[PDB]
Design an enzyme around this catalytic site. Structure first.
Site, PDB file in Angstrom:
ATOM      1  N   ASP A   1      99.550 -18.525  80.359  1.00 32.42           N
ATOM      2  CA  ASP A   1      97.846 -18.582  80.199  1.00 32.42           C
ATOM      3  C   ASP A   1      97.095 -18.719  81.438  1.00 32.42           C
ATOM      4  OD1 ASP A   1      98.203 -19.492  77.385  1.00 32.42           O
ATOM      5  OD2 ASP A   1      98.258 -21.484  77.606  1.00 32.42           O
TER       6      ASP A   1
ATOM      7  N   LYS B   1      94.725 -20.344  84.100  1.00 33.69           N
ATOM      8  CA  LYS B   1      94.575 -21.558  84.197  1.00 33.69           C
ATOM      9  C   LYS B   1      92.982 -21.765  84.660  1.00 33.69           C
ATOM     10  CE  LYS B   1      96.420 -25.500  86.527  1.00 33.69           C
ATOM     11  NZ  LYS B   1      95.008 -26.419  86.682  1.00 33.69           N
TER      12      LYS B   1
ATOM     13  N   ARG C   1      90.077 -30.843  81.173  1.00 26.28           N
ATOM     14  CA  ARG C   1      91.070 -30.900  80.188  1.00 26.28           C
ATOM     15  C   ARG C   1      90.759 -31.559  79.132  1.00 26.28           C
ATOM     16  NH1 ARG C   1      97.642 -31.336  80.917  1.00 26.28           N
ATOM     17  NH2 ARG C   1      98.293 -30.950  78.754  1.00 26.28           N
TER      18      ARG C   1
ATOM     19  N   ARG D   1      90.609 -35.441  80.766  1.00 27.21           N
ATOM     20  CA  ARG D   1      91.860 -35.351  81.298  1.00 27.21           C
ATOM     21  C   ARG D   1      92.523 -36.806  81.554  1.00 27.21           C
ATOM     22  NH1 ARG D   1      90.284 -31.759  84.126  1.00 27.21           N
ATOM     23  NH2 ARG D   1      91.675 -29.902  83.924  1.00 27.21           N
TER      24      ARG D   1
ATOM     25  N   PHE E   1      94.166 -24.439  74.067  1.00 20.81           N
ATOM     26  CA  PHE E   1      95.811 -23.907  74.622  1.00 20.81           C
ATOM     27  C   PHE E   1      96.853 -24.648  73.701  1.00 20.81           C
ATOM     28  CE2 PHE E   1      94.279 -26.744  77.827  1.00 20.81           C
ATOM     29  CZ  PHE E   1      95.187 -27.706  78.041  1.00 20.81           C
TER      30      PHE E   1
ATOM     31  N   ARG F   1     105.909 -34.561  83.126  1.00 17.94           N
ATOM     32  CA  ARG F   1     105.991 -33.371  83.879  1.00 17.94           C
ATOM     33  C   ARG F   1     107.137 -32.869  84.102  1.00 17.94           C
ATOM     34  NH1 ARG F   1     104.945 -31.242  89.703  1.00 17.94           N
ATOM     35  NH2 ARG F   1     106.523 -32.239  89.992  1.00 17.94           N
TER      36      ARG F   1
END
Length: 577
Positions: free
Chosen positions: A245, A247, A252, A267, A337, A414
């Site tokens: 994708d 960025k 977000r 976000r 996304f 993460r």
């Protein structure tokens, strides 16, 4: 449950320095809590009434009004409260002192309901109501309770503890120990509502958390991305296959819809719904589905050219007083996304391709809400090309995402399933130049009819000539490729332009007119090219290794191009190995 237990917690908190003792303090406080109201205790102990994502008014009152409240509660005039405040520097301690200078004790329930009232009361009679409510509270409070009530309302309980700290203490207090952390964290990541999680643990036990799914209206902790700067390393992590994708540089946004109501979380999982009624409209208009949780980037967009604007323009938007003015001056698009929930079905456990397929199918074509620009890369050169297109559109870079059964939505985590590849790829392609098109090459096969390769040259100001530095074929979008034929045919010349110096023969020579921004990994000695002819190596010039077209420079004349001297300089800077 009495509020004294919480005041005692706050007081002890100030005196402790041990992370161990903090866990013990909290675990004790939580386990000795009234199980019926655990969902309030978990925010109170952090100095809050409720989670941020609810978008509720923050608890506060003007300081003069707090002084009035304390003054009422302690039957001391405002002046004396004022004067004690100077010397003490904390109204909480002032309150404490004035309380201890002079039968049913405060319940957490009344503290909570009263403080909620103070937070939520608005309009004309609100100043006086807040004051009366607080004063009644401070009156009922014992000295220590009063101190911490003042601090709480002021937002000056300096707890320095967050949801994670409380989740940890909940593991200890209710889960049987540190081993419970993982189940509790996983549940909170799916449903980032401390009170909701505490409630379940307390009422149904820990095991009930294992089957926890997202709840529309409650944010899921955003999946985070690893980072690497090497495209080959990235695709190896991915099994040689990935969705890539663009960025985006925007907000977000996690967008929830339940029956009809739309929520947008930032976000940081703040409720930003009210900042984006335009986004609310796009979602309700263009996204099919009763209820869902999806994620997208809100990106400021240029009102005339529609091109993307940096995130700071969204901050400017936020500062506008008139929402319609704000929207007109700072329009936005949404680049969606991910999808994590759809019509009562949890998608977080489903592979990315399946979430994306659903996501794509539910968006009606429109100018405002779109799927992130993406490709499926099956090789590193797909990824690099796309990375380079992404940054040629000024972009951050790209997000590379695993596909397949492992490619789940890892809420709050993460790891390697998403990896960002950012402009910090400033190690490989270390060199950027503006060069002159002096000729073109036809491609091969079915596009043997189209120019798809340009002969590029640097400007030599001493001889007023263009000296070939490379032949560029990569970097052109399909559209840019198609535009090349006409662009170059218009300026085609039957013989080499006398100002162009090239040993290399293109299929067509061209007037030296157009300037392109070109990137490569390094400058190399080339027998094929004339740039800096014979300066470093005899019978050779300098070339650009692995050149990629970045963009046209309409704002440059051919004499503004990178000079041969500059080419040499760049080359001479390169490690002599």
């Amino acid at each position: 449950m009495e509020f004294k237990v919480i005041a005692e917690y706050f007081d002890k908190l100030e005196k402790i320095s041990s992370r161990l003792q903090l866990t013990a303090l909290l675990a004790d406080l939580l386990s000795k809590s009234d199980k019926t109201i655990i969902d309030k205790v978990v925010y109170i102990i952090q100095g809050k009434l409720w989670p941020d994502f609810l978008g509720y008014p923050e608890l506060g009152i003007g300081e003069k009004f707090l002084i009035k409240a304390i003054s009422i509660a302690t039957n001391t005039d405002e002046n004396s409260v004022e004067n004690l405040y100077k010397t003490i520097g904390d109204l909480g301690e002032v309150a404490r002192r004035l309380k201890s200078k002079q039968k049913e004790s405060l319940t957490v329930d009344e503290v909570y309901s009263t403080l909620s009232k103070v937070a939520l009361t608005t309009g004309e009679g609100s100043r006086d109501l807040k004051i009366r409510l607080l004063a009644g509270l401070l009156k009922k409070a014992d000295p220590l309770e009063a101190k911490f009530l003042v601090r709480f309302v002021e937002g000056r309980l300096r707890v320095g503890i967050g949801d994670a700290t409380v989740l940890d203490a909940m593991a200890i207090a209710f889960g049987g120990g540190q081993s419970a952390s993982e189940i509790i964290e996983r549940a909170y990541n799916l449903r980032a509502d401390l009170g909701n999680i505490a409630k379940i643990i307390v009422e149904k036990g820990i095991e009930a958390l294992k089957t926890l799914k997202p709840q529309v209206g409650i944010p899921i902790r955003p999946m985070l991305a690893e980072r690497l700067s090497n495209p080959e390393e990235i695709l190896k992590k991915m099994g040689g296959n990935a969705i890539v994708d663009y960025k985006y540089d925007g907000e977000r946004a996690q967008i929830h819809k339940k029956e009809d109501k739309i929520f947008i979380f930032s976000r940081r999982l703040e409720n930003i719904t009210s900042q984006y009624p335009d986004v609310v409209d796009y979602v309700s208009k263009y996204i099919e589905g009763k209820e869902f949780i999806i994620e997208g980037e809100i990106v400021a967009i240029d009102p005339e050219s529609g091109e993307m604007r940096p995130f700071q323009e969204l901050m400017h938007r936020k500062r506008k007083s008139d929402i319609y003015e704000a929207i007109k001056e700072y329009p936005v698009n949404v680049f969606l996304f991910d999808l994590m929930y759809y019509e009562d079905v949890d998608y977080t456990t489903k592979p990315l391709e399946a979430r994306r397929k659903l996501l794509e199918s539910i968006v009606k074509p429109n100018d405002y809400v779109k799927i992130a620009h993406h490709i499926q890369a099956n090789n590193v050169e797909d990824l690099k090309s796309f990375f380079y297109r992404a940054i040629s559109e000024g972009g951050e870079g790209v997000m590379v995402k695993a596909i397949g059964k492992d490619a789940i939505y890892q809420a709050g985590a993460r790891g390697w399933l998403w990896i960002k590849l950012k402009r910090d790829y400033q190690s490989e392609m270390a060199d950027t130049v503006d060069l002159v098109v002096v000729g073109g090459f036809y491609g091969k096969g079915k596009r043997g009819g189209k120019i798809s390769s340009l002969l590029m040259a640097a400007y030599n100001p001493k001889t007023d000539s263009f000296e070939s530095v490379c032949k560029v074929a990569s970097g052109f979008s399909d559209e840019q490729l198609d535009e090349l034929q006409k662009k170059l045919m218009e300026i085609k010349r039957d013989v080499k332009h006398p100002r162009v110096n090239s040993k290399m023969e293109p299929d067509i020579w061209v007037e030296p007119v157009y300037v392109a921004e070109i990137i490569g990994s390094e400058i190399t000695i080339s027998p094929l090219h004339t740039c800096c002819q014979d300066v470093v190596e005899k019978d050779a010039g300098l070339s650009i290794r692995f050149p990629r077209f970045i963009r046209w420079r309409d704002d440059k004349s051919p004499e503004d191009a990178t000079t041969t001297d500059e080419i040499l300089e760049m080359y001479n800077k390169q490690p002599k190995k």
